[PDB]
Amino acid sequence: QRGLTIWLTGLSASGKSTLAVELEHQLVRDRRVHAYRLDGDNIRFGLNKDLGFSEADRNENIRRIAEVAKLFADSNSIAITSFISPYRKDRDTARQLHEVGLPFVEVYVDVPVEVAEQRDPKGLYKKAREGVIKEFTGISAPYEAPANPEVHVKNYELPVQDAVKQIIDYLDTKGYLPAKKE
Amino acid sequence: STNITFHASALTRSERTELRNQRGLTIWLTGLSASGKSTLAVELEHQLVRDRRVHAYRLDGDNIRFGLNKDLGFSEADRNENIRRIAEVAKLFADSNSIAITSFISPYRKDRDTARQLHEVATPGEETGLPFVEVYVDVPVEVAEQRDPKGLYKKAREGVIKEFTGISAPYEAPANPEVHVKNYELPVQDAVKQIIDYLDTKGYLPAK
Ligand SMILES: Nc1ncnc2c1ncn2[C@@H]1O[C@H](COP(=O)(O)OP(=O)(O)O)[C@@H](O)[C@H]1O
Ligand SMILES: Nc1ncnc2c1ncn2[C@@H]1O[C@H](COP(=O)(O)OS(=O)(=O)O)[C@@H](O)[C@H]1O
Numbered sequence: 001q002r003g004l005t006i007w008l009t010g011l012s013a014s015g016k017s018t019l020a021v022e023l024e025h026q027l028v029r030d031r032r033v034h035a036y037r038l039d040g041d042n043i044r045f046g047l048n049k050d051l052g053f054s055e056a057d058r059n060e061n062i063r064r065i066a067e068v069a070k071l072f073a074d075s076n077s078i079a080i081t082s083f084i085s086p087y088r089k090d091r092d093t094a095r096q097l098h099e100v101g102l103p104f105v106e107v108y109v110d111v112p113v114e115v116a117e118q119r120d121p122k123g124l125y126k127k128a129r130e131g132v133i134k135e136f137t138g139i140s141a142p143y144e145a146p147a148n149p150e151v152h153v154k155n156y157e158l159p160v161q162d163a164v165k166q167i168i169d170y171l172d173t174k175g176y177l178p179a180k181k182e
Numbered sequence: 183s184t185n186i187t188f189h190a191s192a193l194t195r196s197e198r199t200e201l202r203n204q205r206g207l208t209i210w211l212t213g214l215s216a217s218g219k220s221t222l223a224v225e226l227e228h229q230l231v232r233d234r235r236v237h238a239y240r241l242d243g244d245n246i247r248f249g250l251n252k253d254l255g256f257s258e259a260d261r262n263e264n265i266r267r268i269a270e271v272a273k274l275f276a277d278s279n280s281i282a283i284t285s286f287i288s289p290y291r292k293d294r295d296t297a298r299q300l301h302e303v304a305t306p307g308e309e310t311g312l313p314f315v316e317v318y319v320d321v322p323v324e325v326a327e328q329r330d331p332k333g334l335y336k337k338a339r340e341g342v343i344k345e346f347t348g349i350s351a352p353y354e355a356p357a358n359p360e361v362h363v364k365n366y367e368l369p370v371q372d373a374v375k376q377i378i379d380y381l382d383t384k385g386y387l388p389a390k
């Protein structure tokens with residue numbers, strides 16, 4: 001198995017983690033590959049527990065996550081990352097770290113702010129509108145959309161399985177996965 | 183939720199091994215510069231992958247200190263942070279169901295204890311932590327000094343490299359490591375056998 005990184009980027013509540021979970025599930029079970037998810041839960045309370053949400057801390061959050069994803073890819077696993085990663089320069093630095101190589105598949109999990117705001121599972125968009133949370137991506141901090149993602153998922157009014165199929169189909173056009181199991 | 187040890191749990195041997203073998207573990211090598219940690223790690227990975235068919239990945243200065251930890255030096259605070267970050271990365275590999283093998287001096291007992299604790303804790307939502315096997319790769323400093331192609335000990339004694347472990351900074355020897363290897367006047371394969379034999383007493387590996 002050749003490793004690679006599948007880098008999800010998009011607004012808070014765009015559906016990145018949900019997509020990552022289903023993607024990992026299909027990859028492991030249907031293609032028999034090794035995959036591991038890096039997300040807020042296993043990174044921001046551990047390796048990056050010293051970081052907040054200032055621009056500088058987000059630059060460092062992503063810098064570290066990209067180096068860790070590269071280690072997983074180097075280990076021959078598929079690293080699936082699910083972080084807002086709002087700054088294009090940091091995503092490009094992450095891509096270069098891999099390519100200079102290991103494949104880096106950037107997946108833009110795209111929903112308009114309106115859709116994420118109506119989901120608002122943890123009520124953070126409402127807090128951001130009220131000024132309780134400062135510098136909140138999409139409301140009071142920037143989201144720099146990817147210019148050239150390998151996969152662009154219009155992730156609204158869309159079954160998670162259709163979104164995952166879109167990603168797996170892309171990986172197959174590049175031959176990154178073993179043939180599907182019978 | 184409140185954690186307890188496997189001993190305190192009353193789970194049987196088959197139950198303990200089944201539960202702790204659901205994911206991976208970390209083999210944490212500690213010892214002086216040039217004590218032989220990375221050498222043992224390469225041979226250990228070779229035997230584990232070859233003879234036992236398990237997945238393992240090595241973390242060492244070459245893949246950590248010029249990437250993730252390129253922002254850190256050798257001050258005490260930077261070594262505390264170097265080890266904290268490595269421990270968290272090794273934990274991710276163990277969580278991913280690989281054997282993480284680390285080869286860092288990790289001179290401070292408090293940092294090795296922090297590394298152990300973050301692995302061993304059963305965090306909310308998981309029922310068990312991840313095993314952490316500390317291996318003291320022990321050689322006298324005189325032996326490490328005879329394994330110094332880059333002359334780091336020489337530079338340390340000359341004052342070119344400040345606070346160098348074993349010469350001008352301390353190495354806090356592990357008091358209770360899982361495995362204590364006296365890695366001199368002993369071929370590497372023998373040291374590795376000592377480590378693998380220990381792993382087998384815990385049942386962490388597929389049958390020989
Ligand atoms: N395709 C989808 N359609 C509608 N809701 C979704 C979809 N995918 C995820 N969600 C919902 O949106 C919320 C945010 O999803 P999540 O995966 O946690 O987002 P993110 O990781 O981008 O912050 C959740 O309540 C989730 O169940
Ligand atoms: N100011 C904030 N901006 C964006 N997300 C925030 C903020 N404060 C808390 N969060 C929470 O943290 C998650 C984003 O964390 P990351 O993906 O790690 O962000 S990133 O910008 O540094 O990539 C959101 O989904 C939300 O749960």
Ligand SMILES: Nc1ncnc2c1ncn2[C@@H]1O[C@H](COP(=O)(O)OS(=O)(=O)O)[C@@H](O)[C@H]1O
Nearest residue numbers: 215243256261264286287288289344345346347
């Ligand atoms: N002051 C120093 N003390 C010990 N090793 C040093 C020092 N400066 C450079 N090194 C080099 O860095 C290696 C030790 O790096 P680490 O294992 O990452 O150290 S640790 O103390 O922070 O765990 C040594 O093998 C040596 O090549």
